[PDB]
Amino acid sequence: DFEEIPEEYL
Amino acid sequence: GQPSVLQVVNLPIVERPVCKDSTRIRITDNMFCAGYKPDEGKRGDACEGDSGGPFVMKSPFNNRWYQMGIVSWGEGCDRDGKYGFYTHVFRLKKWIQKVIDQ
Amino acid sequence: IVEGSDAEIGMSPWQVMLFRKSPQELLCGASLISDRWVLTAAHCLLYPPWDKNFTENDLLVRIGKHSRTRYERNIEKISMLEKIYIHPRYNWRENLDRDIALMKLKKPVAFSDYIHPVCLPDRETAASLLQAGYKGRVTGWGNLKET
Amino acid sequence: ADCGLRPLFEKKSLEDKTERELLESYI
Ligand SMILES: N=C(N)N1CC=C(CCNC(=O)[C@@H]2C[C@@H]3CC[C@@H](O)C[C@@H]3N2C(=O)[C@@H](Cc2ccccc2)NC(=O)[C@H](O)Cc2ccccc2)C1
Ligand SMILES: *[C@@H]1O[C@H](CO)[C@@H](O)[C@H](O)[C@H]1NC(C)=O
Ligand code: NA
Ligand code: NA
């Protein structure tokens, strides 16, 4: 249930 | 079961004899335990997922926060007669400095 | 944290979240001690009995957070690990003696209202504050209950 | 050299809701 983090962070 | 935001709790450091007598696990000088005793009423304890987190104290001398421990282990969570065990940061500071000095 | 309370904003600016890449989940708590060093428990990274042996690439550290699950845009900072250092004498075979590990960040993290390092004690500090009866503070995004 | 001083608290001279509890225990 963790919100997706920016793609830049691998 | 899971908090929506960061949780916090203040807990008193416990006497070594009491820590030792609360568990079957062998305690070493690189550990210390904290938490309220059954007759103190107040509760609180770290638990699964908190591992690695800091146990800090605020100095009344220079008013800075110091990390004295790291959440390490415990038998259950917030059980009467049981305490939270933390890695003794100062005891392992030579190693810390050695690594950072590289 | 069991029987605790909601932390205030900026209350623990040194709190760090060890985040697992895949599956994306909370791994452990940790702490910021300088712009490039994070302190945590050794058993968060290494525990052979369960076949746990994380490498730098398996995780990320999220700093400046408050909310557990949300990506706190413009507030939290996510760093990659350059290297992991586990205490050579960490005793995972028995009692987790010397349960400590350091993680060096690839790039320094910029401090802010929500990101700031905690101090490490010196002898006198430890001696005077580490006494039975004295209270410390523990923080984290772990279980609210044992079961 | 600014370790342990929180931007939103000590730096601004504001106390959090329970830090006093810690101070009180250090008898
Ligand atoms: N501050 C607190 N309370 N805590 C707890 C967790 C943390 C932080 C998280 N840290 C842990 O969980 C560590 C990791 C260690 C290795 C992996 C696994 O075996 C669990 C072991 N841990 C325990 O605390 C043991 C006691 C132990 C100490 C040293 C060597 C071996 C065992 N407790 C239990 O297994 C159950 O709690 C027992 C149990 C209780 C109730 C019901 C079922 C099982 C801090
Ligand atoms: C952990 O994994 C690393 C990388 O594969 C390896 O070098 C090290 O020996 C392993 N340690 C243990 C206890 O498995
Ligand atoms: Na015992
Ligand atoms: Na208890």
- Classify D6 as helix, strand or coil: coil
Q: Specify which residues B2 forms β-bridges with.
A: none
User: What is the rounded CA–CA span in Å between residue D13 and residue C142?
Assistant: 30
Q: What CATH number is associated with residue B85? A: 2.40.10.10
Instruction: Indicate which atom in ligand 2 lies nearest the CA of residue C46.
Output: 13
Please state the domain extents for chain C. Answer: 1-147
User: What is the rounded CA–CA span in Å between residue B54 and residue C16?
Assistant: 9
- Strands of B31-34's sheet in order across: B31-34, B84-88, B65-73, B54-58, C135-140, B7-12, C5-6
Q: How far is CA C106 from the centre of its chain?
A: 16
Chain D partners within 8 Å of B60 (Cβ)? 23, 26
CA angle (D20 as vertex; C124, C29 as ends), nearest 5: 70
Query: Which domains, ranges and CATH numbers included, belong to chain D?
Result: 1-27 (4.10.140.10)
B82: closest CA among B74, B72, B90? B74
Q: Which CATH class is domain C1-147?
A: mainly beta
Minimum distance, in Å, between the CA of residue B83 and any CA atom of chain C = 12
- Give the number of other CB atoms < 10 A from CB of residue C69: 17
Q: How many domains does chain B have?
A: 1
B30: closest CA among C21, C12, C90, C119? C90
3-state helix, strand, coil in chain A (%, to 5): 30, 0, 70
In B1-102, which ranges are E strands?
7-12, 31-34, 54-58, 65-73, 84-88
Helical (H) or strand (E) element with C37: strand C37-40
Q: Phi, psi (5° rounding) for residue D9? A: -130, -90
